[PDB]
Design a protein around this nucleic acid. Structure first.
Length: 493
DNA sequence: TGTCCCTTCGCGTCTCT
DNA sequence: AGAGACGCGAAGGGACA
């Protein structure tokens, strides 16, 4: 809409169609995405030098270009990337993905320029890996983090005996500069006076809005312990996972949730020690009545649902969809809670709703199964992936459905499934594995990296060679995936 | 109306034992 | 194996030009 001058919105839609055109092929959603967080000059600039970016020394993918553009100061980044990508890759040995990853943030120009300028001095003089330097820089106001890290790292490590690991941890977030400065200032105070281990202080600062969480603790720490009878351990739990808002909100709503709604302080901390703790608490304060109602649920279960990232979303979604699932799709509430009691509950429930019938009719599954898939983190993703990949896995690669469901019924189901599709061939023919084995490996959390690891060891029998036969390596990877396999290589080093 | 920086929230995946 | 660490990104707000 955005009126100022006119006649020249023609020049704006001139470009919109041309980007659906060939070097890039942008769909609607992508142009949305650009224009929305990038603005119009972003869109203009993409067009401007679409060819320059797709070939030439840069050879970026469309989705990479979008990623960079879709941020405040996208134009600036795109310009800046053209300039600096090759020099950063050549003169400091970064990958493109790394350069892009630095750029794909607000004030990308600044990060890139600041990386160029300071990558060496940090890597050389302060002995940092470039991995780490990229980590610090790959955020909003990286320039500031980078700059601050230079300034304070000697001070933090000598005067307050902090590992560089820890400094990186703190700086590798939004508002690093703030977190760092705040830690310097408040470390003595918090450790000596309020009796915290520096590990705890870093724990707190090593999230976004750490500055805020730190300040808020120094203030509210005694209060919460003396008055509301909380342990400092509990307070740091909250301060590390939900930070400022959660702390404040806890003080504000603790008495209420115990007097009126009868929860144990134990449980209140559970709920608040997460992202959007503030949000969850306020949500359970409402709703908890109307949830222990419609027959509905016990407090145990409402707590369960709220005690995750985006608890609010879960509770709101549960409240809304509990009827339609229970009556129209025949699920006990026990199951609905199971689904809701993970990260992205909302997302699972909604996905279940719309895919239950499909999987059960079209793909021949019991509801019990679908719930199992859905009763994990990233339920949505597993469900959706099962839908795509069940046929192809059963026919092209020759698995039973019960096997596919097993693979899917774990955190990261999506990945497991996708990874099986990629590797099951090479594994079974080229290295002589037997599908039932491959499935067993994949039917755990970390199924993907399990597989990826197991392969890498066979394709190039790594430093610790011979020694373990394949049936062993399988046994091991079923027992602890990549962690185990790595733990064996590190038993030879 | 663009650019930069900071804080809060939500989703997904893996590992720690 | 459920808790907790970790990575990622959307969204919203403030400051300045």
């Amino acid at each position: 809409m955005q009126w100022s001058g006119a006649r020249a919105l023609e020049a704006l839609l001139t470009v919109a169609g041309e980007l659906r055109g060939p070097p890039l092929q942008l769909d609607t959603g992508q142009l949305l995405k650009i224009a929305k967080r990038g603005g119009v000059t972003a869109v203009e600039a993409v067009h401007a030098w679409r060819n320059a970016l797709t070939g030439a020394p840069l050879n970026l993918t469309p989705e990479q270009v979008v990623a960079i553009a879709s941020h405040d100061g996208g134009k600036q980044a795109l310009e800046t990337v053209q300039r600096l990508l090759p020099v950063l890759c050549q003169a400091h040995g970064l990958t493109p993905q790394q350069v892009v990853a630095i750029a794909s943030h607000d004030g990308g120009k600044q990060a890139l320029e600041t990386v160029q300028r300071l990558l060496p001095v940090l890597c050389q003089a302060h002995g940092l890996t470039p991995e780490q330097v990229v980590a610090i820089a790959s955020h909003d106001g990286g320039k500031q983090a980078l700059e601050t890290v230079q300034a304070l790292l000697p001070v933090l490590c000598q005067a307050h005996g902090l590992t560089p690991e820890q400094v990186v941890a703190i700086a590798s977030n939004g508002g690093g500069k703030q977190a760092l400065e705040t830690v310097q200032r408040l470390l003595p105070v918090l450790c000596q006076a309020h009796g915290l281990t520096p590990q705890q202080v870093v724990a707190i600062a090593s999230n976004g809005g750490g500055k805020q969480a730190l300040e808020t603790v120094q203030r509210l720490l005694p209060v919460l312990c003396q008055a509301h009878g909380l342990t400092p351990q509990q307070v740091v739990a909250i301060a590390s996972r939900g930070g400022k808002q959660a702390l404040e909100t806890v003080q504000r709503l603790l008495p209420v949730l115990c007097q009126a709604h009868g929860l144990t302080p134990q449980q209140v901390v559970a709920i608040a020690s997460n992202n959007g703790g503030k949000q969850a608490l306020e949500t359970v304060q409402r709703l908890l009545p109307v949830l222990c109602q419609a027959h509905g649920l016990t407090p145990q279960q409402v707590v369960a649902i709220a005690s995750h990232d985006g608890g609010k979303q879960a509770l709101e979604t549960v409240q809304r969809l509990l009827p339609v699932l229970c009556q129209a799709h025949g699920l006990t509430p026990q199951q609905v809670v199971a689904i809701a009691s993970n990260n992205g509950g909302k997302q699972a429930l909604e996905t279940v709703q719309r895919l239950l019938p499909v999987l059960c009719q079209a793909h021949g599954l019991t509801p019990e199964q679908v719930v199992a898939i859905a009763s994990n983190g990233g339920g949505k993703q597993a469900l959706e992936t099962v839908q795509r990949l069940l046929p192809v896995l059963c026919q092209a690669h020759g698995l039973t459905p019960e096997q596919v469901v097993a693979i899917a019924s774990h955190d990261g189901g999506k990945q497991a499934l996708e990874t099986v599709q990629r590797l099951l061939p090479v594994l079974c023919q080229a290295h002589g594995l037997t599908p039932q084995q491959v499935v067993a490996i994949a039917s755990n959390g970390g199924g993907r990296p399990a597989l990826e690891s197991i392969v890498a060891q066979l394709s190039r029998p790594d430093p610790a060679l011979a020694a373990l036969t394949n049936d062993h390596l399988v046994a091991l990877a079923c027992l602890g995936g990549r962690p185990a396999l790595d733990a064996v290589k590190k038993l030879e080093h």
